[PDB]
Amino acid sequence: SAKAISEQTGKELLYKFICTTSAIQNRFKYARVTPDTDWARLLQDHPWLLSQNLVVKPDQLIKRRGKLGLVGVNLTLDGVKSWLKPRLGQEATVGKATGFLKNFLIEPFVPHSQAEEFYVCIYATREGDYVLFHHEGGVDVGDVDAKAQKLLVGVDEKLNPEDIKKHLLVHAPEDKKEILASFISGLFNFYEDLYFTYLEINPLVVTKDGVYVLDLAAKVDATADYICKVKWGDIEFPPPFGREAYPEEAYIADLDAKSGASLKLTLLNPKGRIWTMVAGGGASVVYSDTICDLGGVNELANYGEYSGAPSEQQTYDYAKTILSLMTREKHPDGKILIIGGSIANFTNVAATFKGIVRAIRDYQGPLKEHEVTIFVRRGGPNYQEGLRVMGEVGKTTGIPIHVFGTETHMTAIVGMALGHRPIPGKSTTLFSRHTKAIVWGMQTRAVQGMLDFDYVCSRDEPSVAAMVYPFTGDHKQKFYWGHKEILIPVFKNMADAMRKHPEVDVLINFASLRSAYDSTMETMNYAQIRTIAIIAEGIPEALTRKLIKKADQKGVTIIGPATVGGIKPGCFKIGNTGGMLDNILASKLYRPGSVAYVSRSGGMSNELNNIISRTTDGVYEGVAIGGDRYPGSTFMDHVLRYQDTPGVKMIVVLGEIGGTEEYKICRGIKEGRLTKPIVCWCIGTCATQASETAVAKNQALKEAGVFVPRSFDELGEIIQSVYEDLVANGVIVPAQEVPPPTVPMDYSWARELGLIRKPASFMTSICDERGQELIYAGMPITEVFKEEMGIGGVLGLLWFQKRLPKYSCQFIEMCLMVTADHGPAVSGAHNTIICARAGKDLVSSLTSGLLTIGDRFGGALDAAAKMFSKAFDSGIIPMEFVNKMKKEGKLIMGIGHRVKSINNPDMRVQILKDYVRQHFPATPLLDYALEVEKITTSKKPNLILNVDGLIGVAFVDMLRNCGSFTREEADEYIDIGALNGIFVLGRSMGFIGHYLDQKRLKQGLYRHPWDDISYVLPEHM
Amino acid sequence: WARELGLIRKPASFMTSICDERGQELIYAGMPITEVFKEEMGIGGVLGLLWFQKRLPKYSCQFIEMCLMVTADHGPAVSGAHNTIICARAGK
């Protein structure tokens, strides 16, 4: 939307970018004051205040302030500071609103004459731009739109000086005709290319020194920031003038800036009794329309909503804040909570109500004591289980929550809240049964959401011909037409969509705002397409008006942006209109009816389809246009096309506040163009030029001859009454019902709202990876480095799932550091040299080396633990353990060394020997290990504990001596073979080191020559 | 149970156009198991079916059977067979 700019920074960007032939003076002569600035800083940095006169004006978006007397006119340095005593920060009133005044703008006064004061204005319309100029300006313009000079400039058009001199400057000073028109040409490129919307300057001082601005007025679009972030810098649009914010109320806007969900909270009374918690965009202004109509303008407390697929935690916060705000003060007249809702397309009901059933559980105490009565009515995907649990939870807390389904009227519960009622070149036919369309963008769910609609209407052929996406290849995408598999091609360019299949006449775009425009301008060059509809949200208003010129001369109906889409039941459907198939079976949109409607937004569109489907035969053809400021098409273009369609027998209209559109329909029925039955309504009077309100639109349309509802609850009876009249003469024949084909839905969407089941394999209790942070066996990733444990620390977690303390973390890090590679002779490392010389790669030549860790190499760790852990826990004396073995064979594993045993240690078996001596209490095994050594070292000069033998017992002495492992994870983890895990993690780092050496030296293939083989083939066979 | 009476959907990975195994007879790429021995083709015949999915005629079935018969082992010197002696002596 066009957000108003604070006049300080718009004046900064004025002199920064505008370029003309005449001299623009006062470059960067701007100054700011607030109650939170001190006068010592701005007095020194900005020296041009203290030499001429100064003027001071409120930069807080108040209009016509010279006529209000809150401007500091023609004063000196300390003249404005004394003037800024009762105004800088204090309470004051302008118009109909009070509040503080904390911002003011300072610029030096430069004198002028009255004949050098000017008025200039440029504002944006749908059909072009006005440049609006008068040769005298200031605050004395008055009724200015009926006197100043006009010149219509169009979109994608440049401005000539020759029309300025002939039309614009015909009542202007002739001696100032150069300095006027050349400044206009500099502001025109300032206006057009930077996507401004409403610009006006008063007073524009064009003196004989040059051009000067004393005060500015600007409105720029906010949607074009994806192009204009880099040029505007960090542009800030402050809100308009008013009161200060409540503490929890602005806090919800901080949740609004978090996700794509758009949650808005606006009170009217801080202690009312009618409390609203409404889901949907167009639902919240219509419920509040029915509250002020029933007299509740005084005790209505809040109006707000939550949109943009609201999550649980974001609706847990939106719920729990306002139920905590409604229990600060009490009221003997009580309170009433309103929980409404429209037909949501694709989000679940009860999961979006899982937060509100939790937030009532936190403050169920005082919600009983404030004596509240709650109503709930909500529809969409599986609403009734959300209704059943919410009706149950009222009886648990003791408060009566009266539920309501989709069968009742939408605003009926506010009649039951306060007790008003008791509680029980174009085409004409756009789509057909033979229509085919092509979507843009990988949006396969909505393609599936379109394809199933063809199945329930029993259309003969599918409608989606191709998917145009330029960032993949050309292949065929699988879908499910009923139960079978169908192959829809995905294409890369738009011309190849035309070549094999030129029979497509409707083209759709589902891309985002950042690529919507280029996908459209190249499209309408191909004239075989007859209908284009745009869904994307965030489009600039110039890019909105750039598209309309091209289809005007060619004749393609645009149903463009901020649109959910349109429906022609029995024939064709655009987008996720209706949502999943539950609504399509609830309102019977698989066959036509006779009722047509046009609206702006989507939540109102499905609400008609609830109401009309229970009152008429069904819907014939209905389509929303969009909720932007500039709609793609007017209301008139379809309702005259409705007149040119024979199948409809009546026209229903839904109008909105703003825009002079419904008067054309009013003039359309006054000119006799409208002959069919017309029923209209304008939403949102809420009045608590006159051509923009809902008030005159409710009245001027009324005495043209239109059936007009007086409320929204009666809108069901208005269509009910007119349908009874249209069947009285028998022009609407009663259509028979034909039962539809039934379709399987999908899996992943069905399990998402949890209705089926599934058994689960794959236990895997390690390393949660989905979510936001990878949790390890007990810990997130970032918390590991805050304790800063080594990779022994993750070696505790990923293997043993206990927080292993960091005196032993350095042991198992030291443990694999000494069991590295052991030289290229050993039959483990000997394979991975061979598969290095054959030159495979790294990791297919690492795997040929870890295949040798078995029962005759390198698994001696496993024998040098289970020979000792048995013979100690069920153990015997040392000098019978050795006696038992040496009557059987079966030598003690982990013991035996060819080179250095006695009086000459291996110098690394003793390295571990002190590190297990210091930081290791309670060592039964290793002191039992050394006592098997001492008997044997006397027996032979060899037979010391090997490095594999000590680690066979130094690791089991790590387990049953440290904490967090009792006696059952200590023995089983040696039984599974996790002690082999120390080895083949250890020898793996050396094999690659063996490998990288064998590839740097660039060796050739090995052959192992014949003179060792000695073939022993037999005689003859 | 709910998929058995066919009401939900499921997308399908794992294309695998060979060797139907459920039912009563294992069908190969075009043929049940018992029909293979009635033509009585050799294991070159299944080497046509399981690799190329065409009924390869039996003048060339004996060729690809003869083709791997001459590309057997080539002596223990070669660096292919030299690894698998080593992992034999380690006794895995």
| Distance, CA of A129 to CA of A766 (rounded, Å) | 64
DSSP 3-state assignment of A171? Answer: coil
**Calpha distance A17→A469 (Å, rounded):** 39
Residue with tokens 């022609």: A568
Annotate A357-402 with three-state secondary structure: HHHHHHCHHHHHHCCEEEEEECECCCHHHHHHHHHHHHHHHCCCEE
d(CA B12, nearest CA chain A) in Å: 10
Q: Does the N-terminal peptide bond of residue A203 adopt cis geometry, omega within 30 degrees of 0?
A: yes
Determine whether the interchain pair B77/A838 forms a contact, defined as Cβ–Cβ distance below 8 Å.
Answer: no
For residue A854, give both structure tokens.
């078995």
DSSP A100: E
| Residue A882, H or E segment | helix A878-885
Beta-strand runs (E) in A548-618? 557-558, 566-568, 572-573, 595-599
- Distances in Å between the Cα of A71 and the Cα atoms of A56, A83, A96, A206 are 6, 10, 18, 22
Compare CB distances from A827 to B2, B7, B86 and report the shortest one's residue.
B86
Q: Is residue B2 within 8 Å of residue B11, measured between CB atoms?
A: no
Structure tokens at A217: 């007025």
Tokens coding A103: 């911002």
A117 is in an annotated binding site: yes
Contact B92 A854 (CB under 8 A): yes
Please name which of A388, A391, A418, A248 lies closest in space to residue A317, comparing C-alpha atoms. Answer: A248
Residues of A in contact with B76 (CB under 8 A): 1013
**Distance, CA of A315 to CA of A872 (rounded, Å):** 62
CB–CB contact B87 A744 (8 Å): no
In sequence order, the 6+-apart residues with CB closer than 8 A to the CB of A144 are A119, A121, A132, A134
- Contact present, A172 and A153 (Cβ < 8 Å): no
Query: Which residue is listed with tokens 């404030």?
Result: A370
The full 3-state SS of A663-699, as one line of letters, equals HHHHHHHHCCCCCCCEECCECCCCCCCCCCCHHHHHH
Distance from CA of A831 to the nearest CA of B (A): 6
Q: For residue B87, list chain A residues with Cβ-Cβ distance below 8 A.
A: 831, 851-852
The whole-angstrom distance between A474's CA and the closest CA on chain B is 20
Q: Is A710 known to sit in a ligand binding site?
A: yes
Q: Is A844 left (phi over 0), alpha (psi -120 to 50) or beta?
A: alpha
B chain contacts of residue A747, beta-carbon cutoff 8 Å: 8-11
Q: How far apart are CA A554 and CA A556, in angstroms?
A: 6
Nearest CA distance, B36 vs chain A (angstrom): 32
Q: Are A605 and A624 in contact (CB under 8 A)?
A: yes
Q: Which residue of A has its CA nearest to B85?
A: A831
Interface with A, mutate which of B8, B73, B78 (most A CBs under 10 A): B8
Alpha-carbon distance B52 to nearest alpha carbon in chain A (angstroms): 24
Element (H, E) at A315: helix A312-325
Listed in sequence order, the DSSP H helices in A573-704 are 581-586, 603-613, 636-643, 662-670, 694-700
Return the structure tokens found at A780: 């997130």
Q: Which residues contact B68 (CB under 8 A, 6 or more apart)?
A: none
Residue count (chain B): 92
Q: Which residues contact A247 (CB under 8 A, 6 or more apart)?
A: none
CB A676, CB A648: distance < 8 Å: yes
CB burial of residue B79 (10 Å; 0-12, 13-18, 19+) = middle
A110 marked as part of a ligand binding site: yes
Known binding residue A65? Answer is yes
Shortest CA distance to A265 belongs to which of A273, A277, A283?
A277
**Residues paired with residue A945 on neighbouring β-strands, in sequence order:** A895
A770 labelled binding-site residue: no
Kindly determine whether residue A852 and residue B92, on different chains, have CB atoms separated by under 8 Å.
yes
DSSP annotation of A515? G
**Residues A72, A65: contact at Cβ < 8 Å?**
no
Q: Do A269 and A298 form a contact (C-beta atoms < 8 A)?
A: yes
Backbone φ/ψ region at A493: left (φ over 0), alpha (ψ -120 to 50), beta: beta
A266 within 8 A of A300, measured Cβ to Cβ: no
d(CA A877, CA A883): 10
Backbone dihedral angles phi then psi of residue A189, each to the nearest 5 degrees: -70, -25
Q: Which of A597, A623, A615 is nearest to A409 (CA)?
A: A615
Which is nearest to A336 in space by CA: A394, A274, A390, A276?
Answer: A274
Contacts of A205 (CB under 8 A, 6+ apart): A110, A112, A116, A117, A118, A211, A212, A213, A214
Q: Nearest Cα to A868, choosing from A951, A795, A745, A796? A: A951
Chain B residue numbers with beta carbons less than 8 Å from the beta carbon of A857 are 90
For residues A6-41, one letter each, b for 16 or more C-beta atoms within 10 angstroms of the residue's C-beta and e for the rest, the string is bbbbbbebbeeebebeeebebeeebbebeeeeeeee
Long-range contacts of A38-47 (CB under 8 A, 24+ apart): A39/A81
Question: For residue A132, how many C-alpha atoms fall within 13 Å in the half-sphere facing its CB?
Answer: 20
CA distance A934 to chain B (A): 31
Let me know: does A380 contact A347? Beta carbons within 8 Å.
Answer: yes
Distance CA A422, CA A417 (A): 9
* DSSP 3-state of A870: helix
- Cross-chain CB nearest to B91 (options A483, A856, A1005): A856
Residue A848 in contact with partner chain B when CB distance is under 8 A: yes
**Chain A from 4 to 23: CB within 8 A of any B CB:** none
Structure tokens at A707: 């059936």
Using CA atoms, how far residue A225 sits from A228, A398, A543, A826, in Å, is: 4, 51, 13, 67
DSSP assignment, residue A164? I
Nearest Cα neighbor of A573 from A737, A426, A457 is A457
Helix A662-670 to helix A636-643 angle (10° resolution) is 30
Contact partners, residue A217, CB within 8 Å, separation at least 6: A7, A63, A198, A199, A200, A201, A202
Q: Could you identify the residue written with the tokens 């030129």?
A: A502
Contact present, A733 and A726 (Cβ < 8 Å): no
Q: Does A827 touch chain B (CB under 8 A)?
A: yes
CATH number for A248-418: choose from 3.40.50.261, 2.170.130.10, 3.40.640.10, 3.30.360.10: 3.40.50.261
Residue of A nearest to B78 (CA): A1007
What is each CA distance from A34 to A60, A106, A334, in whole angstroms?
11, 11, 43
| CA A772 remoteness from chain centre | 16
Which residues on chain B are in Cβ contact (under 8 Å) with A859?
none
A398 marked ligand binding residue: no
Helix residue ranges per DSSP H, A464-540: 495-499, 518-521
Q: Which two tokens stand for residue A59?
A: 């930069």
Q: Which amino acid is at A253?
A: A
Location of structure tokens 């023609």 = A74
CA A713 to chain centre: 34
CB of A756 within 8 Å of a chain B CB? The answer is yes
From A364, A313, A311, A314, select the one nearest A337 (Cα to Cα).
A364
Going by DSSP bridges, is the β-strand pair A557-558/A475-479 parallel, antiparallel, or unpaired? unpaired
Experimental determination approach used: cryo-EM
| Helix (H) or strand (E) run with residue A279 in it | strand A278-279
Q: Which of residues 29-88 of B touch A (CB under 8 A)?
A: 76-79, 82-83, 86-87
In sequence order, what are the residues at sequence separation of 6 or more whose Cβ sits closer than 8 angstroms to the Cβ of residue A840? none
Task: Please report the resolution in angstroms.
Answer: 4.3
How far apart CA A226 and CA A197 sit, in angstroms, is: 17
* Helix, strand, coil share of chain A (percent; to 5): 35, 15, 50
Beta strands at A595-599 and A651-653: parallel, antiparallel or unpaired: parallel
Pairing between β-strand A302-306 and β-strand A263-267 as defined by DSSP bridges: antiparallel
* Chain A CB contacts of B91 below 8 Å: 854-856
Decide: A681 and A710 in contact? Cβ < 8 Å.
Answer: no
Distances (CA, A) of A201 to A10, A123, A128, A149, A994: 12, 12, 20, 15, 79
Asked whether A274 and A418 are in contact (CB, 8 A), the reply is yes
Contact call for residues A603 and A343 (beta carbons, < 8 A)? yes
What interhelical angle do A978-1000 and A791-800 show, nearest 10? Answer: 130
d(CA B45, CA B58): 7
Distance from CA of B87 to the nearest CA of A (A): 6
* A480 contact residues in B (CB cutoff 8 A): 9
**Among the partner residues B8, B77, B90, nearest to A747 by beta-carbon distance:** B8
% helix / strand / coil in chain B, to the nearest 5? Answer: 40, 5, 55
In chain A, what residues touch B77 (CB-CB under 8 Å)? Answer: 1007-1010, 1013
| Number of residues assigned to chain A | 1021
Chain A nearest-CA distance from B9, in A, is 5
Task: List chain A residues with CB under 8 Å of B6.
Answer: 483, 744
Tell me whether residues A838 and B79 touch, CB distance under 8 A: yes
- Residues A561 and A52: their CA atoms lie apart, in Å, by 52
Q: Tokens for A480?
A: 């499910």
Could you give the 3-state DSSP secondary structure of residue A482? Answer: coil
B10 vs A747: CB contact, 8 Å cut-off? Answer: yes
- Annotated binding residue A630: no
Question: Could you tell me the sign of the dihedral formed by the alpha carbons of A16, A51, A7, A185, in that order?
Answer: negative
